[PDB]
Amino acid sequence: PLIGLLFSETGVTADIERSQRYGALLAVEQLNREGGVGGRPIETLSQDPGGDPDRYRLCAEDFIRNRGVRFLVGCYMSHTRKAVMPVVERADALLCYPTPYEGFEYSPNIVYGGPAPNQNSAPLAAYLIRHYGERVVFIGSDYIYPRESNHVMRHLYRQHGGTVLEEIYIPLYPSDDDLQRAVERIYQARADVVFSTVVGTGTAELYRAIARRYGDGRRPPIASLTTSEAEVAKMESDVAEGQVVVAPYFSSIDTPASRAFVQACHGFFPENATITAWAEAAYWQTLLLGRAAQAAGNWRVEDVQRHLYDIDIDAPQGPVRVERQNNHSRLSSRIAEIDARGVFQVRWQSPEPIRPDPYVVVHNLDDW
Amino acid sequence: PLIGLLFSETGVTADIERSQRYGALLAVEQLNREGGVGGRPIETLSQDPGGDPDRYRLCAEDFIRNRGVRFLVGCYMSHTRKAVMPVVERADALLCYPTPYEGFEYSPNIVYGGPAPNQNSAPLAAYLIRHYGERVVFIGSDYIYPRESNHVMRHLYRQHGGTVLEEIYIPLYPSDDDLQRAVERIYQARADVVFSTVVGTGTAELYRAIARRYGDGRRPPIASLTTSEAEVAKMESDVAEGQVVVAPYFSSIDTPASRAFVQACHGFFPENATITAWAEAAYWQTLLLGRAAQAAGNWRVEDVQRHLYDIDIDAPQGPVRVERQNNHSRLSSRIAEIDARGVFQVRWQSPEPIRPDPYVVVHNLDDW
Numbered sequence: 212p213l214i215g216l217l218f219s220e221t222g223v224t225a226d227i228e229r230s231q232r233y234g235a236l237l238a239v240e241q242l243n244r245e246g247g248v249g250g251r252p253i254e255t256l257s258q259d260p261g262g263d264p265d266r267y268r269l270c271a272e273d274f275i276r277n278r279g280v281r282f283l284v285g286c287y288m289s290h291t292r293k294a295v296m297p298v299v300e301r302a303d304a305l306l307c308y309p310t311p312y313e314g315f316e317y318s319p320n321i322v323y324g325g326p327a328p329n330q331n332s333a334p335l336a337a338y339l340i341r342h343y344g345e346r347v348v349f350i351g352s353d354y355i356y357p358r359e360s361n362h363v364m365r366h367l368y369r370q371h372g373g374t375v376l377e378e379i380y381i382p383l384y385p386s387d388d389d390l391q392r393a394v395e396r397i398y399q400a401r402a403d404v405v406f407s408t409v410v411g412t413g414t415a416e417l418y419r420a421i422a423r424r425y426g427d428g429r430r431p432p433i434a435s436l437t438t439s440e441a442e443v444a445k446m447e448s449d450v451a452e453g454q455v456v457v458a459p460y461f462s463s464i465d466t467p468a469s470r471a472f473v474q475a476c477h478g479f480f481p482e483n484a485t486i487t488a489w490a491e492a493a494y495w496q497t498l499l500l501g502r503a504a505q506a507a508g509n510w511r512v513e514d515v516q517r518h519l520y521d522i523d524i525d526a527p528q529g530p531v532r533v534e535r536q537n538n539h540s541r542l543s544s545r546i547a548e549i550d551a552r553g554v555f556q557v558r559w560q561s562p563e564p565i566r567p568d569p570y571v572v573v574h575n576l577d578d579w
Numbered sequence: 580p581l582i583g584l585l586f587s588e589t590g591v592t593a594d595i596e597r598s599q600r601y602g603a604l605l606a607v608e609q610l611n612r613e614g615g616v617g618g619r620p621i622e623t624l625s626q627d628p629g630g631d632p633d634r635y636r637l638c639a640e641d642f643i644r645n646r647g648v649r650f651l652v653g654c655y656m657s658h659t660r661k662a663v664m665p666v667v668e669r670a671d672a673l674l675c676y677p678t679p680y681e682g683f684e685y686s687p688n689i690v691y692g693g694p695a696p697n698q699n700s701a702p703l704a705a706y707l708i709r710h711y712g713e714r715v716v717f718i719g720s721d722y723i724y725p726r727e728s729n730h731v732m733r734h735l736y737r738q739h740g741g742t743v744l745e746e747i748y749i750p751l752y753p754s755d756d757d758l759q760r761a762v763e764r765i766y767q768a769r770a771d772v773v774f775s776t777v778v779g780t781g782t783a784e785l786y787r788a789i790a791r792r793y794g795d796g797r798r799p800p801i802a803s804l805t806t807s808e809a810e811v812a813k814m815e816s817d818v819a820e821g822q823v824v825v826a827p828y829f830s831s832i833d834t835p836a837s838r839a840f841v842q843a844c845h846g847f848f849p850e851n852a853t854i855t856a857w858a859e860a861a862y863w864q865t866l867l868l869g870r871a872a873q874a875a876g877n878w879r880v881e882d883v884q885r886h887l888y889d890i891d892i893d894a895p896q897g898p899v900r901v902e903r904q905n906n907h908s909r910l911s912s913r914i915a916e917i918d919a920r921g922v923f924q925v926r927w928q929s930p931e932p933i934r935p936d937p938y939v940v941v942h943n944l945d946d947w
Binding site: 296297300301315316317318319362365366378536537569570571572573574575 | 664665668669683684685686687730733734746904905937938939940941942943
């Protein structure tokens with residue numbers, strides 16, 4: 212029972228990915244301190260790809276081709292996932308992707324554990340409009356995830372007679388110059404909501420810069436599908452507060468499942484790793500890989516795959532399951548609002564988990 | 580009634596795209612020599628983007644932003660389509676894409692007139708295996724269409740217990756060196772079928788090179804989803820013959836609809852433009868844009884769009900229609916085999932047009 216962990220320790224998204232790696236290590240901790248799997252311990256491998264799609268492919272290639280790894284948990288940014296995908300498909304291996312993403316992709320060797328657009332973007336557009344206004348400006352990092360995410364958010368805003376004023380992109384490793392010319396464009400647009408697909412390090416700098424250009428008084432909230440407690444941990448409470456995020460989970464949800472997961476994260480994560488919805492996704496997907504294998508009684512991919520879709524996990528977010536029709540997950544969706552003191556204050560929560568529909572045709576979408 | 584035509588006159592795919600532009604010009608010829616549309620003539624615009632995704636975006640931007648064009652027919656290579664897409668979506672314009680492509684994309688402003696994977700790749704994999712063998716080697720040009728097409732063909736081959744030996748990519752503007760190292764890899768692989776996603780100019784050079792490395796006697800056939808009469812026109816009959824292609828149409832089909840389209844193409848295309856299935860797709864989609872507008876009685880996009888999905892065209896290939904659930908087309912699928920004298924000899928034909936399913940989940944696929 213060998214498991215490969217593809218999560219950055221350095222790079223643009225080092226903080227979020229460390230949060231993910233740890234939720235994964237914790238799932239294996241408990242799966243092991245439960246007799247392991249087959250009385251044999253599940254052992255993990257880690258390599259820091261530093262958020263580079265070529266080092267992710269190389270690392271995947273080394274884990275698979277040399278270490279005989281057939282099961283992996285990892286990747287956050289979409290281009291890095293796409294770089295590893297050919298590798299896992301050739302090798303008949305399996306990869307669990309614990310991150311929200313743009314949709315429009317299918318692979319029999321990848322289990323998608325974060326929300327497709329219909330699970331986060333769809334509920335969010337309805338909440339933003341029918342709560343803030345209809346004018347929005349998009350700002351994203353310059354790669355496939357923001358671009359594709361804004362393509363679909365384009366469609367959603369129109370469907371609800373909203374207006375997309377601008378669509379701005381900044382480098383993943385942005386200079387203050389970029390950040391300044393961008394915020395200026397956001398400032399002058401006069402929008403009611405700023406939709407952010409800025410990931411990693413630039414996230415907190417973006418947020419603070421917008422706050423700082425606005426100064427005293429009313430500035431649009433920043434909505435995001437990625438900002439979590441990890442990025443939030445890097446901002447000042449007045450910069451953080453009021454910002455909106457949709458995630459199938461937050462560290463502060465009421466329930467016994469959340470608290471158990473939490474008080475446990477607190478007793479295992481190192482001080483530089485934070486509890487986020489993405490660590491939560493890497494945690495439940497890692498359990499399931501365990502459970503499926505106990506049930507299959509083996510560490511063969513076919514053996515484990517057949518059981519993957521028949522195990523329902525009672526994850527810290529709510530019950531979860533993986534659809535066999537597209538390899539995506541039934542996930543909850545929560546729209547939280549950050550506190551003046553930095554806590555995510557859930558404002559809305561989906562009545563039940565949303566089934567995944569990766570090919571997002573907006574008119575065929577349920578309307579929140 | 581102004582129509583923008585985005586088709587290359589020069590570049591890697593100049594020959595195929597010229598074939599497409601002409602089928603489009605011919606549709607407008609007849610639509611005009613029928614009283615036009617509203618007694619007013621439909622006039623077209625053309626600009627040569629030379630197969631460069633940045634010149635396609637620029638040209639689209641100029642047609643739209645300066646010439647007030649809201650309707651366009653154009654693009655062949657997927658990256659060029661993706662480059663124009665943001666432009667048409669912002670501008671609320673409409674684009675008809677008369678080309679086969681990789682799937683996994685949706686836009687409310689793009690009408691897909693060529694086959695998604697389930698309409699060409701799916702029937703083909705079954706015909707290749709259950710007729711040639713199970714060992715195949717993939718060779719594609721180096722861009723998003725071949726890569727994504729081979730991703731799905733990967734899945735299809737496995738589903739039918741076939742074996743994908745190698746996956747080779749060559750530049751769109753390849754040097755003989757590349758072509759030689761590639762064919763060597765194809766030669767040594769010992770496959771029963773070579774699946775080609777090589778487009779434009781390199782196509783005929785690839786085909787001939789493979790023939791020439793093989794010499795006398797048994798060499799695998801080259802299957803393709805793109806090779807047409809335009810590329811075929813550039814090869815020697817012994818290099819061309821035996822090669823396999825799946826297209827919803829061929830110039831030589833038996834019917835009265837094909838012959839009418841054909842004898843007509845012959846009296847309008849200039850000698851350097853050939854009759855292909857892609858000129859056929861640009862032709863029916865251009866009629867429909869006409870028809871929808873007569874019916875809507877106007878050249879407003881909303882007006883025309885509402886009628887788009889209610890008109891059934893009796894296209895040269897068979898009856899066609901555009902699905903409102905995903906903007907793709909019900910298309911026929913034919914598997915032809917080239918003559919020792921260069922004619923596409925249909926070998927199989929789908930019992931009815933295949934409905935489009937752009938999000939290709941192979942197990943949920945009908946099995947041919």
